[PDB]
Design a protein around this ligand. Structure first.
Ligand SMILES: NC(=O)c1ccc[n+]([C@@H]2O[C@H](COP(=O)([O-])OP(=O)(O)OC[C@H]3O[C@@H](n4cnc5c(N)ncnc54)[C@H](OP(=O)(O)O)[C@@H]3O)[C@@H](O)[C@H]2O)c1
Ligand SMILES: CC(=O)[C@H]1CC[C@H]2[C@@H]3CCC4=CC(=O)CC[C@]4(C)[C@H]3CC[C@]12C
Length: 325
């Protein structure tokens, strides 16, 4: 490694710096958790400085241990790790936001997260069930004002427990509601949403840019494809023939093309892998560049394919994916 003390970062609207390539940690239920531990250690070792998890992924104990293990063995300093967690929808009530963050931190054994996000804007009833249901099997939705959720998030930042705060799965209207909030103290630094060449989010992205909100792309390689979350007949992004042709031309891979596309359009990009080789491969995103004509060809792949509809949460007004953007 010629110089691993530096790496590519973007300045967020609160003055903190976010590494532009993030390691995704979600794995399907059939995968055991010891795997998350090793994969995060490998990611750190490969040069990932941004690590994305969430309370609901049920891996934070493992992800935390991997981070502390790599600090303790001298590979990395805490300040050169950007760690994201997320507030699950059964803790949107403002009184529960801080306890949920403290709980993440306790599982992690870290003093702070770098970023805390409202994970999804549809609230469900508080309690131990992450998806609470009634006698008829219907989800018990909760009526919570997310402005009040945001205010509690602001207090977490002021207490130092989250260096930065942001949102996920917010649409144009929901972001406006937060930006116009009475007494707003901190804008969200980011909106983490699904983004890839079949769903390139240009309209939402331009809106985010106009407000200096960074868009953070998940499922940027086409998603984990885990049923029932993702339909098995959705097209497989990484078999796209334009992506494959650019990959061959560049002597890279479809995945790397998909990742590089996001970097060049100003998006911070996540990439999940629990495989040694693919983990290292994904860091190659910084070793080549796409021309304007290649970026235009990738822009032309847009085709309204949303892998993660999360339509179990459809119905309430805060369900984000029924508006155009
Ligand atoms: N905020 C939200 O609602 C939300 C939703 C989804 C995800 N996320 C975050 O974003 C992350 C990423 O999204 P995602 O999990 O949907 O998946 P993703 O990153 O789009 O895609 C990852 C899949 O691609 C594979 N892969 C990785 N690198 C590859 C390469 N070089 N070549 C070929 N295949 C490769 C992985 O398999 P191998 O593992 O076997 O390599 C994995 O199955 C999550 O883990 C999570 O942290 C957030
Ligand atoms: C990572 C991801 O796409 C998110 C979207 C919806 C989330 C799921 C919501 C339902 C759920 C309930 C559980 O008890 C385990 C976690 C799961 C299985 C969640 C895993 C994280 C999911 C799958």
């Amino acid at each position: 490694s010629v110089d691993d003390s530096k790496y590519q970062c973007v300045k967020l609207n609160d003055g903190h710096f976010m590494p532009v390539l993030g390691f995704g940690t979600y794995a399907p239920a059939e995968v055991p958790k010891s795997k998350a531990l090793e994969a995060v250690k490998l990611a750190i070792e490969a040069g990932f400085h941004h690590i994305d998890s969430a309370h609901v992924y049920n891996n934070e104990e493992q992800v935390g241990l991997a981070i502390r293990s790599k600090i303790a063995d001298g590979s990395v300093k805490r300040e050169d790790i950007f760690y994201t967690s997320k507030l699950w929808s059964n803790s949107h009530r403002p009184e529960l936001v801080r306890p949920a963050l403290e709980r993440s931190l306790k599982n992690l054994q870290l003093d702070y997260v770098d970023l805390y996000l409202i994970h999804f804007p549809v609230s469900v009833k508080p309690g131990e069930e992450v998806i609470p249901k009634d006698e008829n099997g219907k989800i018990l939705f909760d009526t919570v004002d997310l402005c009040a959720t945001w205010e509690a998030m602001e207090k977490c930042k002021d207490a130092g427990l989250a260096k930065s705060i942001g949102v996920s799965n917010f649409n144009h209207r929901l972001l406006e509601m937060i930006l116009n909030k009475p007494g707003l103290k901190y804008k969200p630094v980011c909106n983490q949403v699904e983004c890839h060449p079949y769903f390139n989010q240009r309209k939402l992205l331009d809106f985010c840019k106009s407000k200096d909100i960074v868009l953070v792309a998940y499922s940027a390689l086409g998603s984990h494809r885990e049923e029932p979350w993702v339909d098995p007949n959705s097209p497989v992004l990484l078999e796209d023939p334009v992506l494959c042709a650019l990959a061959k031309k560049h002597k890279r891979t479809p995945a790397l093309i998909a990742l590089r596309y996001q970097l060049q359009r100003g998006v911070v990009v996540l990439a999940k892998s629990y495989n040694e080789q693919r983990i290292r491969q994904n860091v190659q995103v910084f070793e080549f560049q796409l021309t304007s004509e290649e970026m235009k060809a990738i822009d032309g792949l847009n085709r309204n394919v949303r892998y993660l509809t999360l339509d179990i949460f459809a119905g309430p007004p805060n369900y984000p994916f029924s508006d155009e953007y």
